[PDB]
């Protein structure tokens, strides 16, 4: 089940969540670590075990982990995040 959650990021604030994996290896990037006291916690949606699919309309499945880091950083102010609950 795909979940659409909109998170507001600021220039002074960071991502608030850590990702792991590697598309180049043959697997999509997912959320594993969460920083307590950041936009991620404020959203109440960024949970451990989230599979990334698209960010701000940009496809991540066809991009590499390193490339995704740069693209994610390009998102300013309002950032749209699309992930799927994995268990």
From Swiss-Prot:
<comment type="function">
    <text>Plays a role in intracellular protein trafficking and degradation. May regulate CFTR chloride currents and acid-induced ASIC3 currents by modulating cell surface expression of both channels. May also regulate the intracellular trafficking of the ADR1B receptor. May play a role in autophagy. Together with MARCHF2 mediates the ubiquitination and lysosomal degradation of CFTR. Overexpression results in CFTR intracellular retention and lysosomaldegradation in the lysosomes.</text>
</comment>
<protein>
    <recommendedName>
        <fullName>Golgi-associated PDZ and coiled-coil motif-containing protein</fullName>
    </recommendedName>
</protein>
<comment type="subunit">
    <text>(Microbial infection) Interacts with C.rodentium and E.coli (strain Sakai) NleG8.</text>
</comment>
<comment type="subunit">
    <text>Homooligomer. Interacts with FZD5. Interacts with FZD8. Interacts with GRID2 and BECN1. Interacts with CSPG5. Interacts with CLCN3. Interacts with STX6. Interacts with CFTR. Interacts with ASIC3. Interacts with GOLGA3. Interacts with NLGN1. Interacts with RHOQ. Interacts with MARCHF2; the interaction leads to CFTR ubiquitination and degradation. Interacts with ADRB1. May interact with CACNG2. Interacts with CCDC62.</text>
</comment>
<feature type="domain" description="PDZ">
    <location>
        <begin position="4"/>
        <end position="87"/>
    </location>
</feature>
